[PDB]
Amino acid sequence: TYKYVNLREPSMDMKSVTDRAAQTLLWTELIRGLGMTLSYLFREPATINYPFEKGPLSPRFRGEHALRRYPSGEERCIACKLCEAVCPAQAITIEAEPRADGSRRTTRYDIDMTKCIYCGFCQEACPVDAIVEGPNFEFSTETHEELLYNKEKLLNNGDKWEAEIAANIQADYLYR
Amino acid sequence: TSVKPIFSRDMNEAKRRVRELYRAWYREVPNTVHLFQLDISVKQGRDKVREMFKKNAHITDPRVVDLLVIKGKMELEETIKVWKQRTHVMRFFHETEAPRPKDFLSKFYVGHDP
Amino acid sequence: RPTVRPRNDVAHKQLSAFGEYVAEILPKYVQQVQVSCFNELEICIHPDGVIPVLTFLRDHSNAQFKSLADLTAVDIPTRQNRFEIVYNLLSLRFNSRIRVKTYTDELTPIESSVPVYKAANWYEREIWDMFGVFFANHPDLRRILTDYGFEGHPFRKDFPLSGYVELRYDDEVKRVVAEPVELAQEFRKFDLNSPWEAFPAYRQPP
Amino acid sequence: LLQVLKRGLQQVSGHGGLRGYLRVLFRANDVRVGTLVGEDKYGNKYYEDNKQFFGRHRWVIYTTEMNGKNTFWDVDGSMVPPEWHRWLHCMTDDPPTVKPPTARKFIWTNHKFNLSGTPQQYVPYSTTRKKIQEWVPPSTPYK
Amino acid sequence: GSDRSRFLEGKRAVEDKNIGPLVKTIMTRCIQCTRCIRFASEIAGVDDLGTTGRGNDMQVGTYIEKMFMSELSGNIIDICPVGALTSKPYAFTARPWETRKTESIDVMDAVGSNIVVSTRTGEVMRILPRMHEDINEEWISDKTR
Amino acid sequence: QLITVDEKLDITTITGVPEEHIKTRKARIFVPARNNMQ
Amino acid sequence: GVRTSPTGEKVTHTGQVYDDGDYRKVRFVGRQKEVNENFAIDLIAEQPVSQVGSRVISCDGGGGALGHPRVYINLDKETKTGTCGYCGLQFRQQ
Amino acid sequence: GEYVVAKLDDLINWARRSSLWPMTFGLACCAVEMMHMAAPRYDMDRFGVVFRASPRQSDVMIVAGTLTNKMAPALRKVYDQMPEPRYVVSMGSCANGGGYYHYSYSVVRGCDRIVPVDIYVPGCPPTAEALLYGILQLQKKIKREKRLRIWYRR
Amino acid sequence: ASATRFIQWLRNWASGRDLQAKLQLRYQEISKRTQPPPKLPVGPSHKLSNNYYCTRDGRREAMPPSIVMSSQKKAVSPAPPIKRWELSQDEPYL
Amino acid sequence: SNLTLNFGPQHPAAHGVLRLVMELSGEMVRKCDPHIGLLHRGTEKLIEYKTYLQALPYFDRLDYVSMMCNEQAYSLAVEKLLNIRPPPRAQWIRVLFGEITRLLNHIMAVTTHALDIGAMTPFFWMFEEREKMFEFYERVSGARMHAAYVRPGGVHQDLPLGLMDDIYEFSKNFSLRIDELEEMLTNNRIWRNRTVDIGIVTAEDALNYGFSGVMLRGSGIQWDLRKTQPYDVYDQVEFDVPIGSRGDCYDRYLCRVEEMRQSIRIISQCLNKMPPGEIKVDDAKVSPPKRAEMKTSMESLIHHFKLYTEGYQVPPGATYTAIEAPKGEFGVYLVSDGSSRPYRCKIKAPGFAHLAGLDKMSKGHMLADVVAIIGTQDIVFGEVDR
Ligand code: SF4
Ligand code: SF4
Ligand code: SF4
Ligand code: SF4
Ligand code: SF4
Ligand SMILES: [K+]
Ligand SMILES: [Zn+2]
């Protein structure tokens, strides 16, 4: 099924011809356009007062990465490298060895935040909710080097944001 | 050993195109030095043209020669029409590359590469 | 069966019949005709047949493939003719798609199909740029995607992913320069293939 | 038109007089009056007004001092602590005064804002130990 | 196999066995294939491994506390189809998909066993056997490994 | 019409590869050994 | 369990620290070395051993689907506790 | 003496951070989020950041998208023609360091190989709000400048 | 929402519409930002019997292409001619 | 005389950068030679080093105004090679967000076309609508643009509770926003002077030059892949295909405005016909299992482990799959060699053939018209250069 967007015959009766001459000489359709912009002048603007007001986001939002812990304080990550395998940008670098207590834990966990595409595949792949993308999006820096996160930075991000991260996961985990 | 030609049916036909392309490049160099305000001289530019031609002097396949001329003409068209910029022209001279060691001892000192 | 893609035997039969039709009319050029299990018709032809076959498919009243959807190439280094040229055509009259494939190597040119489809102009420039296949009698054959002065044909399987050179700005010469590529982090090659066969239906004879 | 002017006057009174009214005008470029939802431990004050359209219905008046930094004029979004970050960005409807976050012993008690460009900025380094151990020659001339 | 489970019960769990510093045993992963038993008896000529118990409780091991320290012992890591027997030195250090394989030769003796050297990011991660029917078949000695 | 070429096929000059990565490289042609772990 | 080396640089939970003659510690001059202070190895050691009745116990890390894959732990050995391979919690048969 | 130089620095710093005219290099998808920062919800004009600015009238360059080798000389040329003071904001992973295309043969692995960068805005793309946070962060960087203080002590 | 009645009339007259009925700014008609938890359904392969994977294995039902002609009567078209489209009855002409 | 157009306008623009080398005689344009590749990022080569899942985000970044539509095209191609079928609810979600994406694209196409011609104001009004649609993207995927939401097998997650109500509230008011846009442009004599009889292309030429989408329908060709070669559940919704009569910029503008109205009409049916059920194919050898299953069932954990490391293997074969993307026919020629990584992935960008026709369409026009013709083609150089 189709329709014509511009297949109309203008009437050639005198009344219709004089309607078009009036539009040509008196700029009626231009005046109409001025009416529309005038009405907007008197509308409330859509602008918000950033940084005092913020754009709305959802629990699923993919922001700055963080490494999480169990309630006891033990790290969740057990160096399985599923996140490193799936990462589409090869942004993750991991090394691991047996910890002094025998645990399977990483000795390196780097995310090059300038390689990362913020896709969230790592947190999908993680089997123990260890690597997540947090809600923070205001972490721009003055140097490139500050965006090459190592494990200490990511663990500090986890300890910094866990209060929000845990609530957001509580809100969305039944959709996963 | 029966193949579809590109342009030239034998080496003699192919070498005619090579000489025609060299003529065009040879005459273009003075204009290139002026248009791009290059700090190199016309002699340096023409020496570069000779070096690029010489490195392929050992070819004996007329089809390979045709492709080399096809590519050389494309490169000339980029230069004449000023689709290239100054950086593209100067990429033939590798000015910021430090000379790499040639003899066995120099290579031995600096790494494992042959 | 909810998870399995349903078959369409009617279209498989129609495309098979039209495949024989084309082979009967162009025996000088047609080498193979196949219909995939998801109902796509491919005509494999000798490279000399590009213009006759494409012209026939465009102009024949039972074909009318007036629209060139896509023209591309595939590099298979193990083949004597490593390059496979693929034409994806569309017929609005018969609401159908056909695929025409031929082959070439590094030194053998292919006839330009610009006379049949004006759409081919840039597609062939891209194939020349990315694969180094030369198209004879092309009005304006030159690179289209790569940088000026770029050496090599990046879509060849033996061209390295990161190339051979990289750019930076150099203050001493006050311009962007090109130097041999060095990576702070080498791309990490992964061996993913399972050592166990997945699809018995495609097993090749020993 | 007179009722609009009254609401204009109400905002001056609603910000504790002219001095408080001018302070918020110059700090926040906004003189609206909202309901106080709560104040965090750093001094940020959170307000809501659900008659405003979505986006302007919640806001924070940043504290004038945080972690030893004078933030009277210099404020930024990283000053909002995580428990309020969720409410302010409408990721949830309940503020931390009604749905407090779960307490864990490892969670930062003190939020930190973006520290880039300061002496507390993050500096990357390799967290792994040396791989290849070199032979140490004997410290005696037995040769 | 299928793509899902219909097992609604609790799982079995078995205690681990210490058999030396080279082979770590996580015997809950064992699928009772008896490859290690047959290798130890036939290839290595050491009748130390067997099965104790019966039925679902059948357990592969040594029964008593014993070490399987033979010059060919490390080969049971390769033949164990599962992660029940794993290299202790290698533990947790790498995943297979990320290693680069260099096919090379062993120089620890004069046999010349064919090996694969697994490397990652410029580091040697482990040594594996490489099949060669006329030399080492598909085994290596523990010094080589 | 076809021509006759008896030269050995060589495309080194038209591949764009730097000379260093043609003349000093050693290619290894092999069938990969089975991963002994599987 | 942070500790400072003789030069004053903190050692991380992975044991990393630039040695005396390592120029690379120049990157921290005028800035700082990011070190997480909550060493997981020390925190998991503070958890009490859980006393259970059965020979076999299961752990999923707590929180149901928000924990780790559920594994079963054998507690027959009396010389040691059963340790969860995911979260490090310890169990003992009473 | 020092008091007069201190206040003059404040005045000129205030004027410059209050009138930041950006030249946007809309290279790829990051430019879309840049347009949303100009759109009504954020209205960067309300901070004094004008919508339409000519490269020769610009104070800040925003690199919003992937920088290819083919494009790198042209970007440098525009930067070189910018009158000073001039600042560069790198927006998004591609501009920051190559991003998804880091290992491509045709891509510059970060625009900071071509021009000095003042602010790196992370994300793929950064949200319009994250970009606005970065611009506000550049303003506070300008606020900390002490050009006349340094000159006085020369 | 809070425009004076006079301003509502002015912008309604200037635009020629009833703007107040379709404001572009969102108020309280939108969904709550906290929702009750979902309980999502499971697919048709979630069964305890009569569910052998080999009966629902789409990947293994794919076959190599049928070879119609290899170099190893009525005419036909690739499909029947397409049927002429019908004019919209909802609104044929704009 | 020879002249080079600037890379981009002096206001924010998100189409990419173009080097247009032109030959002029007086006011008239005699030759147009677009020089592209300024956003060539070797996407097609990078995909060969990715698993099928890892390559999916690359399609968000092609026509980065039509993200989920590009995801749909790639997903359909892999589903065809896999010989599997996404569940009905996922198909409805894909059509629903496909049309929301069409609205996103057509706002950008129409309003930036106007903005470059000098009509700045509509861009601001309609980008507030785009901002609200970005919120729908963010609520289903967590990202405003590059959602990576539509995947082979279905979609990544089910709609959150309350989302469909919000999509209804948005859709309820959108036609009024279109009307305001038409009030500014449709009957404006300046707008008509800039577009009417500009860039005329005949039906015959449009076909031979490889055009698609509105570039065909503006010339009267009755063709739309959603009608003629339907995919997902497009055969279950009612809508009209707008057709032009003059084949010029003005008719193509009218076609795009009317297509926005039809997209609202389709969205309305999607909101009412949304079925219950799972949102990705119930085959764990293709689609990963639910997280609760992965943490409880041995089979689920294995399949989760393998799908996120090796990825699923795709049977060997080649397909050309195309959709009616907002900019035209968007297709992929996808070659599988039997492994978990594609052997070759050629991307057919509708703007590639459209831009190749710029020289043909600009003949006999003035310099200022070249801007109008580029706008009417709706060119984004992520898909042109790839
Ligand atoms: S978000 Fe995506 S690109 Fe970034 S680290 Fe995770 S998997 Fe890699
Ligand atoms: S973060 Fe998760 S997926 Fe990545 S290595 Fe650790 S446990 Fe595995
Ligand atoms: S080889 Fe491994 S799986 Fe087989 S019986 Fe021995 S320990 Fe068990
Ligand atoms: S990797 Fe193999 S042996 Fe190890 S737990 Fe998984 S299925 Fe068992
Ligand atoms: S960083 Fe992401 S959004 Fe920005 S240009 Fe690159 S791919 Fe596009
Ligand atoms: K093993
Ligand atoms: Zn546990």
d(CA C29, CA C85): 15
Which structure tokens are listed for A23?
């539009």
Q: Give residues with Cβ within 8 angstroms of H42, minimum separation 6.
A: A47, A48, A50, A55, H36, H128, H129, H132
Pocket of ligand 2 (CB under 6 A): A 77-83, 94, 125-126, 128, 130-131
Q: A55 and H99 in contact by Cβ < 8 A?
A: no
Q: Give residues with Cβ within 8 angstroms of E139, minimum separation 6.
A: E43, E72, E75, E113, E129
Q: Find tokens 């698993």 and name the residue.
A: J51
Given a contact cutoff of 8 angstroms between Cβ atoms, the answer to whether C68 and C91 are in contact is no
10 Å CB burial of residue B64 (0-12, 13-18, 19+) is: buried
Judge if the beta carbon of residue E82 lies within 6 A of ligand 4: yes
d(CA J8, CA J17): 6
Residue I32, amino acid: K
Q: Is A96 annotated as a binding residue?
A: no
Question: Which among E106, E96, E109, E111 is positioned nearest to E127, based on CA atoms?
Answer: E106
Q: E2 and J299 in contact by Cβ < 8 A?
A: yes
CA of E30 to the centre of ligand 3 (A): 5
Interface test with D, best of G16, G28, G33 (most D CBs within 10 A): G16
- Option in J17, J130, J131 nearest H71 (CB): J17
d(CA A92, CA A110): 6
- Option in B74, B90, B97 nearest C179 (CB): B97
Ligand 2 atom nearest A96 alpha carbon = 5
Q: Give residues with Cβ within 8 angstroms of A109, minimum separation 6.
A: A67, A77, A92, A93, A94, A150, A151, A154, D127
CA of J269 to the centre of ligand 7 (A): 48
Given a contact cutoff of 8 angstroms between Cβ atoms, the answer to whether J12 and H23 are in contact is no
Q: Which chains border E (3 or more CB–CB pairs < 8 Å)?
A: A, C, F, G, I, J
In a 3-state reduction of DSSP, which class is residue A165? helix
Given a contact cutoff of 8 angstroms between Cβ atoms, the answer to whether J376 and J252 are in contact is yes
Given a contact cutoff of 8 angstroms between Cβ atoms, the answer to whether H98 and H110 are in contact is yes
Q: Find tokens 């001039």 and name the residue.
A: H86
Residue nearest to atom 4 of ligand 3 (CA): E33
Residue nearest to atom 7 of ligand 2 (CA): A77
Residue ranges per structural domain of chain B: 1-114
DSSP letters, chain B, are -EE--SS-SSHHHHHHHHHHHHHHHHHHHHHHHHHTT-SS-HHHHHHHHHHHHHHTTT---HHHHHHHHHHHHHHHHHHHTT-S-HHHHHTTT-TTSPPPP-SHHHHHHH-S--
CA of H92 to the centre of ligand 5 (A): 6
Ligand nearest to the CA of E128: 6
Query: Between β-strands J328-336 and J344-348, what pairing exists: parallel, antiparallel or unpaired?
Result: antiparallel
Q: Give residues with Cβ within 8 angstroms of D75, minimum separation 6.
A: A51, D27, D62
Using the Cβ of A97 and the Cβ atoms of chain E, whether some distance falls under 8 Å is answered with: yes
In order of A61, A167, D107, J144, the CA distances from A171 in angstroms are 12, 6, 20, 19
Q: What's the gap in Å between the CA of A70 and the closest CA on chain D?
A: 9
Angle between helices J52-60 and J67-82 (to 10 degrees): 150
Given a contact cutoff of 8 angstroms between Cβ atoms, the answer to whether J41 and H106 are in contact is yes
Query: If you ran DSSP here, which 8-state letter would residue A124 be given?
Result: H
Query: Between β-strands C96-104 and C41-45, what pairing exists: parallel, antiparallel or unpaired?
Result: parallel
Q: I31 and J173 in contact by Cβ < 8 A?
A: no
Q: Which chains border G (3 or more CB–CB pairs < 8 Å)?
A: A, D, E, J
Using the Cβ of A85 and the Cβ atoms of chain C, whether some distance falls under 8 Å is answered with: yes
H125 prior amide bond cis, ω within 30: yes
Q: How was this structure determined?
A: cryo-EM
Q: Which residue does chain G place closest to D128, by CA atoms? A: G16
Question: Which among A58, J128, J160, J143 is positioned nearest to D89, based on CA atoms?
Answer: A58
Sheet of A148-149, strands arranged across: A92-98, A104-112, A148-149
Given a contact cutoff of 8 angstroms between Cβ atoms, the answer to whether E115 and E104 are in contact is yes
Question: Which among E61, E49, E78 is positioned nearest to E142, based on CA atoms?
Answer: E78
J88 prior amide bond cis, ω within 30: no
Q: Give residues with Cβ within 8 angstroms of H80, minimum separation 6.
A: none
**Rg, C-alpha atoms of chain E:** 17
CA of E40 to the centre of ligand 6 (A): 15
Judge if the beta carbon of residue E32 lies within 6 A of ligand 3: yes
Q: Give residues with Cβ within 8 angstroms of C103, minimum separation 6.
A: C47, C79, C81, C83, C84, C85
Please report the residues numbered 133 through 152 in chain J whose beta carbons come closer than 8 angstroms to any beta carbon of chain A: 135, 138-143, 146, 148
Query: Resolution of the coordinates in A?
Result: 2.4
Judge if the beta carbon of residue A121 lies within 6 A of ligand 1: yes
Q: Give residues with Cβ within 8 angstroms of J200, minimum separation 6.
A: J246, J247, J248, J361
Cβ count within 10 A of residue J24 = 14
Query: If you ran DSSP here, which 8-state letter would residue E29 be given?
Result: G
Which structure tokens are listed for A87?
């990462």
Tell me how many degrees the CA angle J369-J375-J379 measures, rounded to the nearest 5. Answer: 130
Question: Which among J62, J210, J61, J43 is positioned nearest to C71, based on CA atoms?
Answer: J210
Q: Is A141 annotated as a binding residue?
A: no
The values of phi and psi at residue B95, to 5°, are -70, -35
Strand-pairing partners, residue H120, are A141, H90
DSSP letters, chain I, are ----HHHHHHHHHHHTS-GGGG-SS--TTSPPSS-PPP-----TT--SSS--GGGS-SGGG--PPEEEEE-------SSPPPPPPPBPSS-SB-
Chain C residues interacting with chain I (CB cutoff of 8 angstroms): 1-5, 11-12, 14-21, 23, 30-38, 41-42, 62-63, 91-96, 98, 198-202
d(CA A119, CA A121): 6
Q: E98 and A85 in contact by Cβ < 8 A?
A: yes
d(CA C126, CA C141): 9
CA of A129 to the centre of ligand 2 (A): 8
CA of E49 to the centre of ligand 3 (A): 10
The values of phi and psi at residue B111, to 5°, are 175, -160
Residue A34, amino acid: L
Three-class DSSP labels, chain J = CEEECCCCCCCCCCCCCCEEEEEEECCEEEEEEEECCCCCCCHHHHHCCCCHHHHHHHHHCCCCCCHHHHHHHHHHHHHHHHCECCCHHHHHHHHHHHHHHHHHHHHHHHHHHHHHHCCCHHHHHHHHHHHHHHHHHHHHHCCCCCCCCEECCEECCCCCCCHHHHHHHHHHHHHHHHHHHHHHHCCCHHHHHHHCCCCCCCHHHHHHCCCCCHHHHCCCCCCCHHHHCCCCCHHHCCCCEEECCCCCHHHHHHHHHHHHHHHHHHHHHHHHHCCCCCCECCCCCCCCCCHHHHCCCHHHHHHHHHHCCCCCCCCCEEEEEEEEECCEEEEEEEEECCCCCCCEEEEECHHHHHHHCHHHHHCCCEHHHHHHHHHHHCCCHHHHHC
d(CA H38, CA J120): 12
What are the respective helix, strand and coil percentages of chain E, to the nearest 5? 15, 25, 60
Three-class DSSP labels, C44-79 = EECHHHHHHHHHHHHHCCCCCCCEEEEEEEEECCCC
Q: Which chains border J (3 or more CB–CB pairs < 8 Å)?
A: A, C, E, G, H, I
DSSP letters, D52-100, are SPTTTSEEEE--SEETTEE-SS---GGGS-HHHHHHHTTS-SS-TTTSP
- Option in H37, H53, H127 nearest J144 (CB): H127
User: Which residues of D are less than 8 Å from A73 in CB distance?
Assistant: 104-106
Q: How crowded is the C-beta side of H81, counted as CA atoms within 13 Å?
A: 11
Q: Which residue does chain F place closest to B7, by CA atoms? A: F3
Helices (H), chain C: 9-25, 50-59, 120-131
Q: Find tokens 């559920």 and name the residue.
A: G70
The size of chain I, in residues, is 94
Strand-pairing partners, residue J367, are none
Given a contact cutoff of 8 angstroms between Cβ atoms, the answer to whether A127 and G68 are in contact is yes
Chains A and I touch (3+ CB pairs under 8 A): yes
Q: D54 and I2 in contact by Cβ < 8 A?
A: no
The values of phi and psi at residue C145, to 5°, are -105, -40
Judge if the beta carbon of residue A119 lies within 6 A of ligand 1: yes
CA E50 to chain centre: 16
Given a contact cutoff of 8 angstroms between Cβ atoms, the answer to whether A5 and J258 are in contact is yes
Given a contact cutoff of 8 angstroms between Cβ atoms, the answer to whether J235 and J324 are in contact is no
Q: J162 and I23 in contact by Cβ < 8 A?
A: no
Which structure tokens are listed for C40?
């796509």
Query: Between β-strands H119-121 and H87-91, what pairing exists: parallel, antiparallel or unpaired?
Result: parallel
Cβ count within 10 A of residue E90 = 15
In a 3-state reduction of DSSP, which class is residue G24? helix
CA of A174 to the centre of ligand 7 (A): 21
Judge if the beta carbon of residue E19 lies within 6 A of ligand 3: no
Helix (H) or strand (E) holding E97: none
Strand-pairing partners, residue J324, are J329
Q: Find tokens 């506070």 and name the residue.
A: H140
- Option in A45, A88, A115 nearest H97 (CB): A115
Helix (H) or strand (E) holding C170: strand C165-170
Q: D53 and I32 in contact by Cβ < 8 A?
A: no
Helix (H) or strand (E) holding E124: strand E123-129
Q: Find tokens 């097998």 and name the residue.
A: J153
Cβ count within 10 A of residue A134 = 24
d(CA B52, CA B64): 15
CA of A67 to the centre of ligand 2 (A): 9
Quick one: residue G15, left, alpha or beta (phi over 0 = left, psi -120 to 50 = alpha)? left
User: Which residues of A are less than 8 Å from D78 in CB distance?
Assistant: 136, 138-139
CA dihedral H63, H67, H70, H73 (to 10 degrees): 40
Using the Cβ of E121 and the Cβ atoms of chain J, whether some distance falls under 8 Å is answered with: no
